[PDB]
Write a protein that binds this ligand. Structure first.
Ligand SMILES: NC(=O)c1ccc[n+]([C@@H]2O[C@H](COP(=O)([O-])OP(=O)(O)OC[C@H]3O[C@@H](n4cnc5c(N)ncnc54)[C@H](OP(=O)(O)O)[C@@H]3O)[C@@H](O)[C@H]2O)c1
Ligand SMILES: NC(=O)c1ccc[n+]([C@@H]2O[C@H](COP(=O)([O-])OP(=O)(O)OC[C@H]3O[C@@H](n4cnc5c(N)ncnc54)[C@H](OP(=O)(O)O)[C@@H]3O)[C@@H](O)[C@H]2O)c1
Lengths: 235, 235
């Protein structure tokens, strides 16, 4: 059996992504801190399709050692798709920002994502049908006032993922890497401002998965979702 | 007594930057792991100008708690300029990259720089004459094959620093933030390929310090150094 691994599966995009992959008949490994929420999701998925396998892994990915330990626990499973979706944003002027929150953004949005991505590439680069999908942000391509550090973490995610995707293509690897860049969603007034629901964003994630473009990005102004080629300059 | 604080001062750009600021009459706080190298630099500086105050701080900035401990010690001094120059690079394909090296790159190139930058902004944003200079890379604006993770760390540094610089301007803060983006230097056959020496880069750093532009960048193709406005898209 093959598995789709989703971090940040207890709420938001990751929760709806788990449901979307389940509707496609995928076995799932769902990871987040809130164990009860993950168990709730598992029950919903199995009530929908009793034949699926769903593995719950409650773990804090902001601790480096937990990232490596999670990956080693996953070695007993054939991973078809890894979605690095867990992440955190904190909006503030830099001068009075809570630096412990900053540390969290760095550990989760950058470190956990790059380590899990790199371990997955190491082991699965040559395996047919594999996909790595990293969740960035439209703010990983445009700096947004009051989100300077958060945006910088997403510039990391976008540039890392584009670079890796192009490296894999140049190497003729079987594994593909792709980046999803949501704009405003319900997890961030609603009467006057455009946003996507988490369910809509999971649908866009499936579209990215199903197509052969590296970038799936929501324009921050028009809210149109577009599949497109890498955005950043490349040597 | 005011001080210019330079991380990564034991060799390379930071070493030459220390000498350049000493020639401008600045007292210095010089930081790196190799205490003996910092002590040698101090002796070279005082041979030139015996009246300068030069404080040696040997510390490993890849350890989070050390970054905060260092900043606490720096509270004993009036900091005029902070230069976040300590950094390193590792060139590899992702699939076989040393992840210990990756962790160190993340900790030093991103975490130490963002923490020290943010603490400095908190305390000095309203203090006339202060400057924060972060050392990125031309690879923080162009992704370079075989340097995917390194480039992503520098995309972080560039986007963080541009965002912060614009935030300070919008807030009418006295503190200025700027980013230096070197291309190839001697720290990275030779007779066919252009590069800047560390001394030349330190001269470009002084030019950035002296002028009214946020970005000082070496074009990867022409090796021309240009002072310019922020490069990344901004909302
Ligand atoms: N405009 C934007 O930039 C934008 C908008 C929407 C989404 N996004 C991105 O999309 C991703 C999903 O976000 P979302 O909107 O769905 O928000 P969300 O509802 O807050 O989901 C975040 C997920 O990550 C989990 N997680 C958080 N911290 C964790 C930790 N230390 N260890 C393990 N898991 C952790 C959270 O669950 P637990 O608390 O149970 O651990 C949750 O399942 C994120 O990368 C976010 O940055 C970006
Ligand atoms: N084209 C490019 O991308 C490019 C080219 C050149 C330079 N740069 C950037 O310029 C900066 C300076 O680099 P450089 O060329 O001058 O290289 P370098 O000669 O290797 O200098 C690096 C400095 O950082 C120090 N340092 C390294 N690790 C440290 C740690 N854990 N804790 C504290 N200090 C540490 C090193 O001294 P110790 O070993 O004594 O700690 C040294 O003083 C870096 O940010 C680098 O990324 C970029």
């Amino acid at each position: 059996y093959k598995y789709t691994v989703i971090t940040g599966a207890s709420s938001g995009i990751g929760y709806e992504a788990a449901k979307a992959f389940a509707k496609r008949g995928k076995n799932l490994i769902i990871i987040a801190r809130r164990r009860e929420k993950l168990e709730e999701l598992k029950k919903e998925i199995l009530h929908y399709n009793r034949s699926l396998k769903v593995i719950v892994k409650s773990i804090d990915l902001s601790i480096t050692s937990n990232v490596y330990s999670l990956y080693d626990e996953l070695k007993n499973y054939n991973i078809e798709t890894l979605v690095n979706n867990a992440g955190f944003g904190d909006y503030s002027k830099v001068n009075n920002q809570n630096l412990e929150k900053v540390e969290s953004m760095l550990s989760l949005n950058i470190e956990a994502l790059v380590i899990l991505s790199s371990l997955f590439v190491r082991d699965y680069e040559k395996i047919e049908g594999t996909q790595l999908i990293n969740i960035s942000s439209a703010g990983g391509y445009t700096i947004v006032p009051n989100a300077v550090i958060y945006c910088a973490t997403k510039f990391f995610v976008s540039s890392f993922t584009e670079g890796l995707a192009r490296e894999l293509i140049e190497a003729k690897s079987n594994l593909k890497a792709k980046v999803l860049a949501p704009a405003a969603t319900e997890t961030e007034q609603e009467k006057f401002h455009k946003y996507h629901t988490s369910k809509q964003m999971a649908e866009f994630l499936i579209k990215l998965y199903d197509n052969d473009y590296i970038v799936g990005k929501v324009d921050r102004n028009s809210f149109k979702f577009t599949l497109q080629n890498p955005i950043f300059d490349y040597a």
